[PDB]
Amino acid sequence: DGANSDAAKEYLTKDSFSYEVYGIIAMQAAYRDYDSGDAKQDDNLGGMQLNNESRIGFRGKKQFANFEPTFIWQIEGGYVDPSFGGEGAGLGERDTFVGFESASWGQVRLGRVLTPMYELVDWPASNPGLGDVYDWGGAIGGAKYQDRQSNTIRWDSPMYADKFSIDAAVGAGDKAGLGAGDDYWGGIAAHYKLGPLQLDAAYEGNRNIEAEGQTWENNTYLVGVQGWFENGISFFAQYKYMEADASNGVNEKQDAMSAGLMYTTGDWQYKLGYAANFDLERDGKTLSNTSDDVVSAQIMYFVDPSAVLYARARMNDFNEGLDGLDDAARWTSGTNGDYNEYSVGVEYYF
Amino acid sequence: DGANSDAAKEYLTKDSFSYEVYGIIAMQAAYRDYDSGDAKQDDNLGGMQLNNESRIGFRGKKQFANFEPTFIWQIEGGYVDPSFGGEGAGLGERDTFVGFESASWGQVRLGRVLTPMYELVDWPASNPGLGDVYDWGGAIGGAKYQDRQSNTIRWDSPMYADKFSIDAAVGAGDKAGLGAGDDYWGGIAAHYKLGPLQLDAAYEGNRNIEAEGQTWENNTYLVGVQGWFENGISFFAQYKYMEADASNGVNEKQDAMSAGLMYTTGDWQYKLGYAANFDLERDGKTLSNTSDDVVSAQIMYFVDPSAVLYARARMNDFNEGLDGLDDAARWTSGTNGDYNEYSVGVEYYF
Amino acid sequence: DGANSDAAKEYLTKDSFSYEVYGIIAMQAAYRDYDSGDAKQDDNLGGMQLNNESRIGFRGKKQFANFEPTFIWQIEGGYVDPSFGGEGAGLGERDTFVGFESASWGQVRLGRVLTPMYELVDWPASNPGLGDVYDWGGAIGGAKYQDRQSNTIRWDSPMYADKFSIDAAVGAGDKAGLGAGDDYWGGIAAHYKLGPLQLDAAYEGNRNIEAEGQTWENNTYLVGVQGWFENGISFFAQYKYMEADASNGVNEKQDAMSAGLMYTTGDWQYKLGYAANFDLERDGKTLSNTSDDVVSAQIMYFVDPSAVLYARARMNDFNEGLDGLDDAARWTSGTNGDYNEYSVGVEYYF
Ligand code: NA
Ligand code: NA
Ligand code: NA
């Protein structure tokens, strides 16, 4: 089977010991307390679990004898036993790609990577515990943005004059990737370094998204800032604007923000985070109680140059529900209900 | 996505070459002959298959600069092509955890491990071929015990005065681990070395188990012995008592045993095993023909310090059926039918 | 869990550093244009995708102290993000086995490997892009041959007098491997080296295949040739004959061919390929428009001793449909429809 069978094994010189095995060992003990309005549902979903996000991966680089841009590749396993999920993960569930790189133009990767929008949404703006609201939370129809996506080409510019860099990508959609649709997307992000700050902007457009009996276009825009100061304070903040249009003429808008403050002293780092989705608007009218917010607090200990321990507390207050354009409840991160969470954790890189 | 995104990669020192890749290569060619009472079912289930239980794993230890108890981790793949099952296994399907260790108090592991009761059930008392009866075999409602389980904290004491040790654990249940229930369990085991013998005891309690229209509590108790003598004989034996109670008042009891005899001489080891589940009792009344037994023989050759070859024959006589508390047949290891099996195998550890 | 639990870990000497990690990194950017007769189906299936056939594997060899034939094993992961498929692959999805070897009698492998017939069908005769027609393409009932199959024992003879070798195997079928049937197969292939040519023959017989309300027997025969000349031309050609019989008396025949021509000069290789299935015959009558063909072209650049780049164009014209013996459409590689494809790719071996 395959584009070239096992011809590589049979005929090419094996480039032996030209790989690296790496891993992130990550374990979070997390207790949740739900207030869904059904006591049974609250017992099911709540309680204590262990969220094992450990993963193994493989990567390398090769300078080919007859091609100047260095070849690069990586294959990264999924999380091995996350909470709310069964055990076991395959290779290639996370960032998994091939590509090429040259000083003058940066790097191009083909495969499964983060979109430029998602990379900023995820880090810094989803940490700590903010993701349910700011990563996949939201009430808009269509697809606000992809996150980690297969069938993607992505270019990462170099750092021009030590200050400026661009991330750009296009790819197939979730259905297209299975031969079941013609969804696609593109997007771009930029970063400007500036004394102690960095400025971020990003865009993502998603086309031919099918959902709720309709085809959608999405556009999503974002701005934010980040700073680190010599006194040990650092922070971030962002604003995120989301628009969608359906094939039947319906328009939808919703916006959001996320911010964090952090103080690093000696081997410690304290951190507070807040993020919010505001009420959604459909065809000019606001839908009441379609907003979400989350507050979070964290302390982290630099236990080894290669590792950290952390404790964290957070409160999610989610929206009270909406219908999509087919008269059915639209799934949101709030569908399972309001919940709080206490957790401790460890992360180690080899 | 995740508790900390890719922050570990981006900010921590990579602790390079601080891992080990290991594996157990294991292949059993096994021929089964079924006598289910349906000739078609006998052809399907019987015949020759290759039971590939090979697996790969990853593990290590790290002495963190600011924490005295040594960090330990492991991630172990599932069996790659076992009989009765499709090809392929993910990482984390087997014992997969993080933890910490200190000479004075032993070791604590968090993640996916064997329960203390299951560890003694499995080894020595399931070998060879005794598992259909004594591992997952049985007729009791609820859950007699978990086996390999995610969402588990487990403490392994040291060997106190060279003689005594304890294994203790608690964790979430099979439903809880998916946010679909509030099942949990706890258990403990102890071991006492004593001239040529070791004595074992263990317990497991499972709570909020849903099955058959009811919530169950289970309690399981076990006692056994193991011995090795200078003449090359060794053996084991165990007695296992299982009780369950349902939310509607029904009580169930069933007990069981397993024993093995071995003679080790030069590069060989001969082995006979026997295990049995006795007739089940429900609300004081015995249910006839709800018992199971199995007899097994084996010869094994120490073909290398790192490997063994073996041949094995066994005969399983399973129970004739029972209904659970919803008037539906209750699945047991006997539901598929009586069968015999001849096998040969190899196992290698690197 | 398992034939011998964790006994190997606990009692055998760990044969440390006695393994190899290897991979093939393989990425094909492929654009398809379908002409199915439904424009919607054409958009879904067509478009651009990235077909990531990268995989990781593990292998090794061990000279056991008390057994002369060297022990061999391998475990090979599946493709990590192929087109038309979700992300992620487990270990053991590809050639995964244990075995033994001796210079005087060759090698025996037990596990999951290619059938002797399929190996010749796949390579040389499915490259480049010929597979939809000549690999899994066809209209015959039953199973023309297995491809990569678990539950297989396979013997690879040595090269007798530097000229002659045999590949032979038997194993369980797709249903048998899950305890759901008594299907099996056997097959054999031979190769005769002869100045610049090699002659191939092969056979496969499949028994107790259930499909379309009937039990089938299949027999498949193949002859071909291959040559490499010092001037830089090489080629291959094959003829493949497929017969089937059903339990209700129906007979089916179909034949096929595949050929390729190659010119290798300096760092380049040009390649043209053609393959065809001819009209199928059932109970002596030909069924019109049940044939398939494909033409393909390719250029490949030997970019490094360990790697290649390539570009490729191909045109598949498939059959127009048939019914199986139950009055329902029989699935073929033409069911989705005629399509063309342009692709570029890279392959690297470490
Ligand atoms: Na996605
Ligand atoms: Na379980
Ligand atoms: Na098959």
CSV table of C-alpha atoms in Angstrom, one decimal, chain C residues 1-348:
chain,number,residue,atom,x,y,z
C,1,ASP,CA,-3.7,-9.6,31.8
C,2,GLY,CA,-2.1,-11.8,29.1
C,3,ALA,CA,-0.5,-15.2,28.5
C,4,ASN,CA,2.3,-14.6,31.1
C,5,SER,CA,1.3,-11.3,32.8
C,6,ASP,CA,4.4,-9.1,33.5
C,7,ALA,CA,6.5,-12.1,34.4
C,8,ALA,CA,9.2,-11.3,31.7
C,9,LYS,CA,9.9,-7.9,33.2
C,10,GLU,CA,9.9,-9.4,36.7
C,11,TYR,CA,12.1,-12.4,36.2
C,12,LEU,CA,14.1,-12.2,32.9
C,13,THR,CA,17.4,-10.3,32.4
C,14,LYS,CA,16.6,-7.1,30.5
C,15,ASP,CA,18.6,-7.3,27.2
C,16,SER,CA,19.3,-3.6,27.3
C,17,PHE,CA,20.2,-1.4,24.3
C,18,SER,CA,19.1,-4.3,22.0
C,19,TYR,CA,16.7,-2.5,19.7
C,20,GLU,CA,16.6,0.0,16.8
C,21,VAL,CA,14.1,2.8,16.2
C,22,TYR,CA,13.6,3.6,12.6
C,23,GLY,CA,11.2,5.5,10.4
C,24,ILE,CA,10.0,6.4,7.0
C,25,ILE,CA,9.0,10.0,6.7
C,26,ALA,CA,6.7,10.3,3.8
C,27,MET,CA,4.4,13.2,2.7
C,28,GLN,CA,2.5,13.6,-0.5
C,29,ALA,CA,0.6,16.8,-1.3
C,30,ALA,CA,-2.1,15.4,-3.7
C,31,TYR,CA,-4.9,17.2,-5.6
C,32,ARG,CA,-7.7,15.2,-7.1
C,33,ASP,CA,-10.3,16.0,-9.7
C,34,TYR,CA,-13.3,13.6,-9.7
C,35,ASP,CA,-15.9,13.1,-12.4
C,36,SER,CA,-18.4,10.9,-10.7
C,37,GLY,CA,-21.5,12.2,-12.5
C,38,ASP,CA,-22.6,14.1,-9.3
C,39,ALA,CA,-21.0,17.6,-8.9
C,40,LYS,CA,-21.6,17.5,-5.1
C,41,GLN,CA,-19.8,14.2,-4.7
C,42,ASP,CA,-17.0,15.6,-6.9
C,43,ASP,CA,-16.4,18.6,-4.5
C,44,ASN,CA,-16.5,16.4,-1.5
C,45,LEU,CA,-14.0,13.8,-2.6
C,46,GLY,CA,-11.9,16.1,-4.7
C,47,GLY,CA,-9.7,18.9,-3.7
C,48,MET,CA,-6.2,19.1,-2.2
C,49,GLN,CA,-5.1,17.0,0.8
C,50,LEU,CA,-1.9,16.0,2.4
C,51,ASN,CA,-1.3,12.4,2.6
C,52,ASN,CA,1.1,11.8,5.5
C,53,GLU,CA,2.4,8.2,5.3
C,54,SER,CA,5.1,8.8,7.8
C,55,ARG,CA,5.7,5.9,10.3
C,56,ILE,CA,7.9,4.9,13.2
C,57,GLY,CA,9.0,1.4,14.0
C,58,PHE,CA,11.0,-0.8,16.2
C,59,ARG,CA,13.1,-3.9,15.5
C,60,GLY,CA,15.9,-6.2,16.6
C,61,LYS,CA,17.7,-9.5,16.6
C,62,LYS,CA,18.9,-11.7,19.4
C,63,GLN,CA,21.2,-14.7,19.5
C,64,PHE,CA,19.8,-16.8,22.3
C,65,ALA,CA,22.3,-18.8,24.2
C,66,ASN,CA,20.5,-22.2,23.8
C,67,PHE,CA,19.0,-22.0,20.3
C,68,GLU,CA,21.0,-21.7,17.1
C,69,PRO,CA,18.5,-19.9,14.9
C,70,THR,CA,18.7,-16.1,15.6
C,71,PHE,CA,15.5,-14.5,17.0
C,72,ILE,CA,14.1,-11.5,15.1
C,73,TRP,CA,11.2,-9.1,15.8
C,74,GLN,CA,9.7,-6.0,14.6
C,75,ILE,CA,6.9,-3.6,15.5
C,76,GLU,CA,5.9,-1.0,12.9
C,77,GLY,CA,3.5,1.8,13.3
C,78,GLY,CA,0.7,2.7,10.9
C,79,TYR,CA,0.6,5.9,8.7
C,80,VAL,CA,0.2,8.9,10.9
C,81,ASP,CA,-2.2,11.2,8.9
C,82,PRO,CA,-3.0,9.8,5.5
C,83,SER,CA,-5.5,11.5,3.2
C,84,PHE,CA,-9.2,10.6,3.6
C,85,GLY,CA,-8.4,9.5,7.2
C,86,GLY,CA,-8.2,10.9,10.7
C,87,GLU,CA,-5.0,11.7,12.4
C,88,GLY,CA,-3.1,9.1,14.5
C,89,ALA,CA,-1.8,5.6,14.2
C,90,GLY,CA,-1.0,2.8,16.7
C,91,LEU,CA,2.1,0.6,16.9
C,92,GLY,CA,1.6,-2.7,15.1
C,93,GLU,CA,-0.6,-1.4,12.3
C,94,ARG,CA,2.1,-2.4,9.8
C,95,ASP,CA,4.5,-5.3,9.5
C,96,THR,CA,4.7,-6.6,13.0
C,97,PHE,CA,6.1,-10.0,13.9
C,98,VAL,CA,8.5,-12.3,15.6
C,99,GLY,CA,10.6,-14.9,13.9
C,100,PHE,CA,13.8,-16.9,13.4
C,101,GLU,CA,16.6,-17.2,10.9
C,102,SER,CA,19.4,-19.5,9.7
C,103,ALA,CA,21.6,-19.1,6.6
C,104,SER,CA,20.9,-22.7,5.4
C,105,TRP,CA,17.0,-22.3,5.4
C,106,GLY,CA,16.3,-18.6,5.3
C,107,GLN,CA,13.7,-17.0,7.7
C,108,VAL,CA,10.3,-17.7,9.2
C,109,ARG,CA,8.1,-14.9,10.6
C,110,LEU,CA,4.9,-15.2,12.6
C,111,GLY,CA,2.5,-12.3,12.8
C,112,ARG,CA,1.4,-9.6,10.5
C,113,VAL,CA,3.2,-9.5,7.2
C,114,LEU,CA,2.6,-9.3,3.4
C,115,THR,CA,1.3,-12.3,1.6
C,116,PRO,CA,3.7,-13.5,-1.2
C,117,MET,CA,1.3,-12.6,-3.9
C,118,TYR,CA,0.5,-9.1,-2.5
C,119,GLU,CA,4.2,-8.3,-2.1
C,120,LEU,CA,4.6,-8.6,-6.0
C,121,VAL,CA,1.3,-6.9,-6.7
C,122,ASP,CA,2.3,-4.0,-4.5
C,123,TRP,CA,5.9,-3.7,-5.7
C,124,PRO,CA,6.8,-3.3,-8.5
C,125,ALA,CA,3.4,-3.4,-10.0
C,126,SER,CA,1.4,-0.7,-8.1
C,127,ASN,CA,3.9,2.1,-8.5
C,128,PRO,CA,3.2,4.9,-9.4
C,129,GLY,CA,-0.5,5.5,-8.7
C,130,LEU,CA,-1.5,2.1,-10.2
C,131,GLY,CA,-2.9,0.8,-7.0
C,132,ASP,CA,-6.5,1.8,-7.3
C,133,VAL,CA,-6.7,-0.4,-10.4
C,134,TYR,CA,-4.1,-3.1,-9.7
C,135,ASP,CA,-3.8,-3.3,-5.9
C,136,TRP,CA,-7.3,-3.3,-4.4
C,137,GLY,CA,-9.1,-2.5,-7.7
C,138,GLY,CA,-11.1,-5.3,-9.4
C,139,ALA,CA,-14.7,-6.6,-9.7
C,140,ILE,CA,-14.4,-10.2,-8.5
C,141,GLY,CA,-16.5,-11.6,-5.6
C,142,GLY,CA,-14.8,-13.2,-2.6
C,143,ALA,CA,-11.3,-12.2,-1.8
C,144,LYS,CA,-8.8,-12.1,-4.6
C,145,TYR,CA,-6.0,-12.0,-2.1
C,146,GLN,CA,-5.2,-10.6,1.4
C,147,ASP,CA,-2.6,-7.8,1.5
C,148,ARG,CA,-0.9,-7.1,4.9
C,149,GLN,CA,-2.5,-9.8,7.1
C,150,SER,CA,-2.3,-10.7,10.7
C,151,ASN,CA,-2.3,-14.4,11.9
C,152,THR,CA,0.2,-15.4,9.3
C,153,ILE,CA,3.2,-17.7,9.2
C,154,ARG,CA,5.6,-17.0,6.4
C,155,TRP,CA,8.8,-18.6,5.2
C,156,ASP,CA,11.3,-16.7,3.1
C,157,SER,CA,13.8,-19.1,1.5
C,158,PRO,CA,17.3,-18.1,0.9
C,159,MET,CA,18.7,-17.2,-2.6
C,160,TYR,CA,19.5,-20.7,-3.9
C,161,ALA,CA,22.6,-20.7,-6.1
C,162,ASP,CA,22.4,-16.9,-6.2
C,163,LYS,CA,19.3,-17.2,-8.5
C,164,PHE,CA,16.3,-18.8,-7.0
C,165,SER,CA,14.1,-18.0,-4.0
C,166,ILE,CA,10.6,-18.9,-2.6
C,167,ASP,CA,8.2,-17.0,-0.4
C,168,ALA,CA,5.4,-19.1,1.2
C,169,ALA,CA,2.8,-18.5,3.8
C,170,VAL,CA,-0.6,-19.5,5.3
C,171,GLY,CA,-2.8,-17.7,7.8
C,172,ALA,CA,-6.2,-16.9,9.2
C,173,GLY,CA,-8.7,-14.7,7.5
C,174,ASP,CA,-10.2,-11.3,8.3
C,175,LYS,CA,-13.1,-12.8,10.2
C,176,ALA,CA,-11.2,-15.7,11.8
C,177,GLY,CA,-8.8,-13.2,13.4
C,178,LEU,CA,-11.8,-11.9,15.5
C,179,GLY,CA,-13.4,-15.3,16.3
C,180,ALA,CA,-16.1,-14.5,13.8
C,181,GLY,CA,-15.4,-17.0,11.0
C,182,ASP,CA,-13.2,-19.9,9.6
C,183,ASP,CA,-11.7,-18.1,6.6
C,184,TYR,CA,-8.1,-18.9,5.8
C,185,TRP,CA,-5.7,-18.7,3.0
C,186,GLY,CA,-2.3,-19.9,1.7
C,187,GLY,CA,0.0,-18.7,-1.0
C,188,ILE,CA,3.5,-18.8,-2.6
C,189,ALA,CA,5.8,-16.9,-4.9
C,190,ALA,CA,9.0,-17.6,-6.7
C,191,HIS,CA,11.7,-15.5,-8.3
C,192,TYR,CA,14.3,-16.5,-10.8
C,193,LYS,CA,17.3,-14.1,-11.4
C,194,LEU,CA,18.6,-14.3,-14.9
C,195,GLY,CA,21.3,-12.0,-16.2
C,196,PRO,CA,19.5,-8.6,-16.0
C,197,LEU,CA,16.0,-9.9,-15.4
C,198,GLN,CA,14.1,-11.5,-12.8
C,199,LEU,CA,11.0,-13.7,-13.4
C,200,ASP,CA,8.2,-13.8,-10.9
C,201,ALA,CA,5.3,-16.2,-10.3
C,202,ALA,CA,2.8,-16.3,-7.5
C,203,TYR,CA,-0.4,-17.9,-6.3
C,204,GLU,CA,-2.9,-17.3,-3.5
C,205,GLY,CA,-5.9,-19.4,-2.4
C,206,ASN,CA,-8.5,-18.0,-0.1
C,207,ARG,CA,-11.1,-20.4,1.5
C,208,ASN,CA,-14.4,-19.9,3.5
C,209,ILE,CA,-14.8,-16.2,2.6
C,210,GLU,CA,-18.2,-15.1,3.4
C,211,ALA,CA,-19.8,-12.3,1.3
C,212,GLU,CA,-23.0,-11.6,-0.6
C,213,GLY,CA,-24.9,-14.4,1.2
C,214,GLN,CA,-22.5,-17.1,0.1
C,215,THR,CA,-19.2,-18.8,0.9
C,216,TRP,CA,-16.4,-18.3,-1.7
C,217,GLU,CA,-13.2,-19.9,-2.8
C,218,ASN,CA,-10.7,-17.7,-4.7
C,219,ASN,CA,-7.6,-18.6,-6.5
C,220,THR,CA,-5.3,-16.0,-8.0
C,221,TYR,CA,-2.2,-16.5,-10.3
C,222,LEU,CA,0.4,-14.1,-11.4
C,223,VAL,CA,3.4,-14.0,-13.7
C,224,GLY,CA,5.8,-11.2,-14.4
C,225,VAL,CA,9.1,-9.9,-15.2
C,226,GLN,CA,11.5,-7.2,-14.3
C,227,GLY,CA,14.7,-5.9,-15.8
C,228,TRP,CA,17.4,-3.4,-15.1
C,229,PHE,CA,20.1,-2.5,-17.6
C,230,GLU,CA,23.3,-0.7,-17.3
C,231,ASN,CA,22.2,2.0,-19.8
C,232,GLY,CA,19.7,3.2,-17.2
C,233,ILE,CA,16.5,1.6,-18.5
C,234,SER,CA,14.6,-0.7,-16.3
C,235,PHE,CA,11.0,-1.9,-16.4
C,236,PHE,CA,8.4,-4.4,-15.2
C,237,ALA,CA,5.3,-6.2,-16.4
C,238,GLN,CA,2.8,-8.6,-15.0
C,239,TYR,CA,-0.3,-10.6,-15.9
C,240,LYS,CA,-2.7,-11.5,-13.1
C,241,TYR,CA,-5.5,-14.1,-13.4
C,242,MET,CA,-8.3,-14.2,-10.8
C,243,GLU,CA,-10.9,-16.9,-10.4
C,244,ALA,CA,-13.7,-17.3,-7.8
C,245,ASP,CA,-16.4,-19.8,-7.0
C,246,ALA,CA,-19.4,-19.4,-4.7
C,247,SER,CA,-21.3,-22.0,-2.7
C,248,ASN,CA,-24.4,-21.6,-5.0
C,249,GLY,CA,-22.4,-22.7,-8.1
C,250,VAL,CA,-21.6,-19.3,-9.6
C,251,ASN,CA,-18.1,-18.9,-11.2
C,252,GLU,CA,-16.3,-15.7,-11.9
C,253,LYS,CA,-13.1,-14.8,-13.7
C,254,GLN,CA,-11.2,-11.6,-14.3
C,255,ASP,CA,-7.8,-10.8,-15.4
C,256,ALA,CA,-5.5,-7.8,-15.3
C,257,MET,CA,-2.1,-6.4,-16.2
C,258,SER,CA,0.4,-3.7,-15.1
C,259,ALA,CA,3.5,-2.4,-16.6
C,260,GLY,CA,6.2,0.3,-16.1
C,261,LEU,CA,9.1,1.9,-17.9
C,262,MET,CA,11.9,3.8,-16.2
C,263,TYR,CA,14.9,5.8,-17.2
C,264,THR,CA,17.5,6.6,-14.6
C,265,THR,CA,20.2,9.1,-15.4
C,266,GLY,CA,22.5,11.0,-12.9
C,267,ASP,CA,20.2,12.1,-10.1
C,268,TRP,CA,16.9,11.7,-12.0
C,269,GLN,CA,14.4,9.0,-12.7
C,270,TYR,CA,11.5,9.3,-15.2
C,271,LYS,CA,8.7,6.8,-15.1
C,272,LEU,CA,5.6,5.8,-17.0
C,273,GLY,CA,3.1,3.3,-15.7
C,274,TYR,CA,-0.1,1.6,-17.1
C,275,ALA,CA,-2.4,-0.9,-15.5
C,276,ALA,CA,-5.8,-2.4,-16.5
C,277,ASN,CA,-8.5,-4.8,-15.3
C,278,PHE,CA,-10.3,-6.4,-18.1
C,279,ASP,CA,-14.1,-7.0,-18.2
C,280,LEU,CA,-15.3,-9.5,-15.7
C,281,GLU,CA,-16.8,-12.8,-16.6
C,282,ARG,CA,-19.6,-14.5,-14.6
C,283,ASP,CA,-20.9,-18.0,-15.4
C,284,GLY,CA,-19.3,-17.8,-18.8
C,285,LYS,CA,-20.8,-14.3,-19.8
C,286,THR,CA,-18.8,-11.1,-19.9
C,287,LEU,CA,-20.2,-8.1,-18.1
C,288,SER,CA,-19.8,-5.0,-20.1
C,289,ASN,CA,-18.0,-2.0,-18.8
C,290,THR,CA,-16.6,-3.7,-15.8
C,291,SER,CA,-13.0,-2.9,-16.7
C,292,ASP,CA,-10.6,-0.2,-15.3
C,293,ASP,CA,-7.5,1.4,-16.4
C,294,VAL,CA,-4.9,3.9,-15.2
C,295,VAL,CA,-2.0,5.8,-16.8
C,296,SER,CA,0.6,7.6,-14.8
C,297,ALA,CA,3.8,9.7,-15.1
C,298,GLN,CA,6.4,10.6,-12.7
C,299,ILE,CA,9.7,12.4,-12.2
C,300,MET,CA,11.8,11.7,-9.1
C,301,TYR,CA,15.0,13.4,-7.9
C,302,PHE,CA,17.6,11.6,-5.8
C,303,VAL,CA,18.0,14.5,-3.4
C,304,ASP,CA,20.2,12.7,-0.8
C,305,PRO,CA,21.4,9.1,-0.4
C,306,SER,CA,18.6,8.9,2.3
C,307,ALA,CA,15.7,10.6,0.4
C,308,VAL,CA,13.8,11.6,-2.8
C,309,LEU,CA,11.5,14.3,-4.1
C,310,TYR,CA,9.0,13.5,-6.8
C,311,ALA,CA,6.1,14.8,-8.9
C,312,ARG,CA,3.4,12.7,-10.3
C,313,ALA,CA,0.3,12.9,-12.6
C,314,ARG,CA,-2.2,10.2,-13.2
C,315,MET,CA,-5.6,9.4,-14.8
C,316,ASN,CA,-7.9,6.7,-13.5
C,317,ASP,CA,-10.8,5.5,-15.6
C,318,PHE,CA,-12.9,3.1,-13.7
C,319,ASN,CA,-15.7,0.8,-14.4
C,320,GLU,CA,-19.4,1.8,-14.4
C,321,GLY,CA,-20.7,-0.7,-11.8
C,322,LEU,CA,-21.9,-4.2,-11.0
C,323,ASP,CA,-24.2,-6.1,-8.7
C,324,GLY,CA,-22.9,-8.9,-6.5
C,325,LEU,CA,-24.9,-12.2,-6.0
C,326,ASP,CA,-27.4,-10.6,-3.6
C,327,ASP,CA,-28.7,-8.0,-6.1
C,328,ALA,CA,-26.8,-5.2,-4.3
C,329,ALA,CA,-24.0,-3.0,-5.8
C,330,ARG,CA,-20.6,-4.7,-5.2
C,331,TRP,CA,-18.1,-2.2,-3.9
C,332,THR,CA,-15.2,-1.5,-6.3
C,333,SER,CA,-12.4,1.1,-6.4
C,334,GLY,CA,-14.6,2.7,-9.0
C,335,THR,CA,-17.6,3.2,-6.7
C,336,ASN,CA,-16.5,6.7,-5.9
C,337,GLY,CA,-15.9,7.6,-9.6
C,338,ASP,CA,-13.3,8.5,-12.3
C,339,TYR,CA,-10.6,10.9,-11.1
C,340,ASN,CA,-7.3,12.5,-12.0
C,341,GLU,CA,-4.5,13.5,-9.7
C,342,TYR,CA,-1.4,15.7,-9.5
C,343,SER,CA,0.9,15.3,-6.5
C,344,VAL,CA,4.4,16.1,-5.3
C,345,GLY,CA,6.1,14.3,-2.4
C,346,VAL,CA,9.1,13.5,-0.3
C,347,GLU,CA,10.4,10.3,1.3
C,348,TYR,CA,13.2,9.9,3.9
